[PDB]
Amino acid sequence: VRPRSDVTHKQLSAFGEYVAEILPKYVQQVQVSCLDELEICIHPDGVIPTLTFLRDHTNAQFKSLADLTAVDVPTRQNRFEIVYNLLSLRFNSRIRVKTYADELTPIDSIVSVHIAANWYEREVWDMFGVFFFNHPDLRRILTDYGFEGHPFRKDFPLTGYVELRYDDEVKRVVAEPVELAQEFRKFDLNSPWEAFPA
Amino acid sequence: RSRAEYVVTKLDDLINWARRSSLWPMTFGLACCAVEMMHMAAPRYDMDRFGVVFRASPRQADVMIVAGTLTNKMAPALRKVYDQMPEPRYVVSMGSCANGGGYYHYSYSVVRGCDRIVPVDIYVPGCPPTAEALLYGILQLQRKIKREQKLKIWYRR
Amino acid sequence: HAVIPHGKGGRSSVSGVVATVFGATGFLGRYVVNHLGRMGSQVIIPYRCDVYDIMHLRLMGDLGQLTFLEWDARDKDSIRKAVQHSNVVINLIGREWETRNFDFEDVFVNIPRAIAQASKEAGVERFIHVSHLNASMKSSSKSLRSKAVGEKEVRSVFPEAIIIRPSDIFGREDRFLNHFANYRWFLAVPLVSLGFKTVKQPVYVADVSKGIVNATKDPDAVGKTFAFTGPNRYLLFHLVKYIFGMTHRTFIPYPLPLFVYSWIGKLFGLSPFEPWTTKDKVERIHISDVMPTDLPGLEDLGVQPTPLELKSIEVLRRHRTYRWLSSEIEETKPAKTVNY
Amino acid sequence: NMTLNFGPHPAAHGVLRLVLELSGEMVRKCDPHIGLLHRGTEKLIEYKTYLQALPYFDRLDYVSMMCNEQAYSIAVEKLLNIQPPPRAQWIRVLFGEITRILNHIMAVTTHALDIGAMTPFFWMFEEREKMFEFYERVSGARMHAAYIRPGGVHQDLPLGLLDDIYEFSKNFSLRIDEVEEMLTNNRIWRNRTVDIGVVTAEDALNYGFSGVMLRGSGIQWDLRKTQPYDVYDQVEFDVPIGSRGDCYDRYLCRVEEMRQSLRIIEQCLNKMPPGEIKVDDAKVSPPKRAEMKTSMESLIHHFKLYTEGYQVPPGATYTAIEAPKGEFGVYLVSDGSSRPYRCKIKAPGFAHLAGLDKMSKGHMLADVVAIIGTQDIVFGEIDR
Amino acid sequence: TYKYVNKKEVDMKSATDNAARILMWTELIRGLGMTLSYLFREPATINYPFEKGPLSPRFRGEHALRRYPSGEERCIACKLCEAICPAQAITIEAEPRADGSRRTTRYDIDMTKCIYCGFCQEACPVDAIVEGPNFEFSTETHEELLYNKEKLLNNGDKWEAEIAANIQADYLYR
Amino acid sequence: TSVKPIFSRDLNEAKRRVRELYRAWYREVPNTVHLMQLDITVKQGRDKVREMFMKNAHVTDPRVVDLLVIKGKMELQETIKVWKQRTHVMRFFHETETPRPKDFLSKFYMGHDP
Amino acid sequence: LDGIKDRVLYVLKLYDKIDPEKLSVNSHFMKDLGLDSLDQVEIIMAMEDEFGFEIPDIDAEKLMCPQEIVDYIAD
Ligand SMILES: CCCCCCCCCCCCCCCCCC(=O)OC[C@H](COP(=O)(O)OCCN)OC(=O)CCCCCCCCCCCCCCCCC
Ligand SMILES: NC(=O)C1=CN([C@@H]2O[C@H](COP(=O)(O)OP(=O)(O)OC[C@H]3O[C@@H](n4cnc5c(N)ncnc54)[C@H](OP(=O)(O)O)[C@@H]3O)[C@@H](O)[C@H]2O)C=CC1
Ligand SMILES: COC1=C(OC)C(=O)C(CC=C(C)C)=C(C)C1=O
Ligand code: SF4
């Protein structure tokens, strides 16, 4: 059993209401996970406003952005779930603000609020395809220069569709449709028996 | 002896001894197997002792050790540098990530092996192939060169 | 004996052609192994060059597709084991220089006859023998004349053995195109008859290769003597200048009697290390291309020839000076076509 | 500003297509290119079970082989609400610190090799070597151990390691001292390092630097003291904060944490408890081999654990430790399944590289080489 | 608890001291002394072929398949070594041997795919697949690195004596 | 229906951008062939560009068109500045791949599944 | 003033995917030639190179008439 300190669960819950009241607009489903972690959820339009309040509020200074990520729940209408994890050096606390973005409904960029996001937002576009308005320079950060398709999308094949080899005839590296010599063995692992939720 | 056969073989050997004693490597240092090579260069297992120089640019490099994943973006470069080396050149693939694909074999951004982009002469196995193992691999390249008989084939051609 | 062809068509797929290819290390060869490997065929490459030189061929073949066996032409046993398990044998064994230990007749005729005899013994389904175009037993150049003797013999050792007969080949690393371009070192570029009356029809190497490969996988070709020729003929004059044109190097065609010139070829021939020009070459160069009257090759075998000007830029780019390398073929002027 | 495409074999970890426009020897703009080592580590993990994704973390930033493993461990333990046994915790802090030294010996000595000092690297790579041997005699692998697993360590320390992790520690100091007599006050190290890449305090927090890079600017933040993980709370160490943050100051900080880690290692050897090294829940930790070969419930638990997996309860967590480079965090979203759903690895390094632009401004070609060194960029973590 | 790594009168004595440091390069000479000192220390390198860097029993090294003393190969094809391999390296297909027992017709470890994690060593119930001590198996051709049951069984027979000693030393720990 | 707009409220306002990109790409082709020393025609390259722009001619939705040119503009910026090399450009001009036939006889003869 | 029409007519026929002797000043690229929307774009660009003046993004949209192009170029 982990050493939970209820002292935290309460204080962070209380801040969660604080933020919910301060920004009744743009903020819904604020919940403190059973892991002593807060995860305000905001309407995509509240990206700029909610972050700024957290970066510049005396009672909630959240100066550095630990990470910007986008889980992809294909079932969910709004496929992506942009998650921004932020840290308060002054209050020794951390919070998560997560929004939802569909493939062709872009989110605002927070490079203004935190310049850390300049790179992570490019990372989210390259892997998942979400677009960020007002970004200084969006461009592939991790994928190859000519890569077609957004890789971390759940609908993208792991091996992908193209692989590279050197061809003598043309004396230059050349893509070809992927041909694998041992396909990824897809072990089915889920057990047909559940675990009675505690 | 003066039979030109014994005149030649001997000459070839000299040529082989020179290339095999002084192999100047270059380490693309992709990934981590680079850390296990820096260890070779380091004091427990001195590479120089054998005549391998710690570092060399591509122009002056006899052998290229590809350590680490050869990702699809780096694949055009590897080739360039392989193509920018001298006429007597060799490639020692190091790491399961470069021998084949390694843990990242099924990925979309990793070339499944460097021998799909550069001809490879010795494949050194192991995720962090042990530095002693690289040293074993560099020593096997030395036995591969010793056996090469370029002038005798010229003479018999 | 066969291998059902499974796969999508690229590397790591199977086509079912196990093929010994004795002279693969060659300029044409390199290409033959390329397609055979691309298709997924099993390729056995006999080699007598050192292992370092054979390395370039390893990468185009997929894992286990290419097997390299050592082999000596004088030793009959080596040819025997190479064709043991092959069902297709392709012979590209030729050298334009006559080396001290192998005389033109030996490389062009003796080595192929023994190789063809071995696969008849082995039971290879088909043998493809390659001999130079316009080759007659009473022709001007010994190489050609001999090659002509050869195509005959192998027929008796191996009946119904395809005999593709390519023209001089156009490709990167070829001689036809590079040789002329390399005349730069020579201040003047001698051209017999000032490069006239020796109309020539080049053929891209790949076209030749693809053609050859297609032969291996087609029942229509048996005893056929195809002639891969090209998409356009040329008087040697335009060819020479054109080359110099893309190379962007001046041209001074100079008439010099073939009589005296055969002597220049003799001079280089004298050189120990791969003579650059050959008495037998010289004649060949001024040996006029024969009009296609033999079995159609390209197109007939399935590949549409590729014009010289199209890929010339790639072959002659290295010959060019540092400046002019960004010069591209369409701003430059393509030379006229003389069918004659 | 003629783009020089300065980069790949350069002075980086193999891959830095650092394309740069330089008016003569002055850098006008640096646009680092990344992904030369992207390999798919984040997508591959979704197709693998929790225990078979542990080896990926060692490869994410492999100079710091284990410290990375602790971050996934912690994360998977939180999701399961299981915590390791007491001895395992101390171990992880023991090898956690040994690993910090290993990273700093890499960062300080590799920094110098690019600068041009080559003897410090050979001096300390011999000490590194000796440390690797600890890894090997504990895990089996010199690097890429897989020793720190999601429920504690894999196997207890060999009978005798602690004594040797003492002899070494007892001496390593002098080895750090030597490097010093060669670089800390060199009349020349200072010049190429001092006042190069100064980063303000407000700007360091803004660009998410989170590492020595913040600590060097004088911001006091060590996730190990602010948010204790494992038993780093029970030890006593001093964070080496810096002022006049610049390449030289941060360096001094990295030499000082090498010093402070020896203080933490000493304690761990002095106070490691008798006990088990893995949770006793066969549910999360694999059963001992004597037990699986004599007890049916243990075989069933061995078979299911290795073939299927932990079956972590559905949830998501961001757990960050203080990896030698900086804050290493895993955001591990998890469905009830035995294989994860997402695992964004926060790499101290994606943020640091981004800062290269705002650090190397109006700087010479040699300055860029010095700054890539003062960020300890391991392209594995950045590219993931 | 924090510490200031670099947080900071002019007297002739002081200045003259400082000026001498710049003028006669005093600290630079200090650095030369350190390197001269080691020149006199014994070098730490080992003759690689003659002397080998020490590896303790858990070293993973090269894969081998063990056999029971009697001579029956240990593997019973449960195939969970295949299940837990992180890289998909091990490929196993099995069928009941005429004896009626359960054995693997084909066991192929692709060593280039393998990342030498050592979990297979961990997972096997009969402990048939073990991480053998040898690390020197560098091969001229890629195909040699792919290993079928016969190479691994042969590898097992060659190194069985040391593998048995190594497992003997470390089994109490596991 | 009822979808927020990325770039153009309506298609006629977006085609505009598509064209502008078309202009930019048109002019770029010539320079690239020379700088990257490619084995292609200036007209040939310009032909490919046409091909691509047309491939996605069917898109009717304004939002999809806007992101397509968002992608398109970054493509030419990497094409320019020579971030893409010859190997990444020539790939557009697919080579070394046996175009797969679409005739049923061709599919029946080779390939188990069409 | 006609010289412009002389140059404009020369540019239209030279690309050779249009005006196979059906070139007319009243002729409209989109209306009767059928030349594609994009192809027109190429045309306007073409005219820009010979004229030496680059016309804006929009006005290309209004002129599909060679004669109207000469009208604008003269301005
Ligand atoms: C009546 C009397 C009349 C005469 C009066 C004389 C007065 C006393 C003499 C005054 C001058 C004494 C010193 C002269 C040489 C040193 C000059 C000097 O200042 O060195 C330049 C440089 C200074 O260091 P830095 O910190 O960069 O500069 C600070 C100020 N900007 O220093 C450096 O950067 C040095 C870098 C050296 C790098 C290589 C070091 C090698 C060290 C070992 C070799 C030392 C020399 C061995 C010589 C052997 C014999 C030839
Ligand atoms: N390129 C041309 O000029 C044309 C050639 N041809 C024909 O096509 C064939 C291939 O042409 P190309 O590739 O240019 O020829 P090459 O000069 O490249 O040589 C072809 C191969 O023959 C091998 N070879 C030569 N002599 C011997 C020998 N004594 N014993 C064993 N092997 C030998 C060579 O191997 P190694 O060098 O390793 O000994 C080489 O790999 C030739 O036989 C020629 O008749 C037809 C038209 C034009
Ligand atoms: C600090 O960064 C560097 C590396 O990582 C440590 C390298 O591996 C390499 C590769 C060089 C060797 C000898 C592995 C270089 C050049 C480098 O600058
Ligand atoms: S092989 Fe193992 S070590 Fe070498 S690169 Fe791939 S992962 Fe890193």
Ligand code: SF4
């Ligand atoms: S686990 Fe051990 S026994 Fe079961 S299959 Fe793999 S190897 Fe054979």
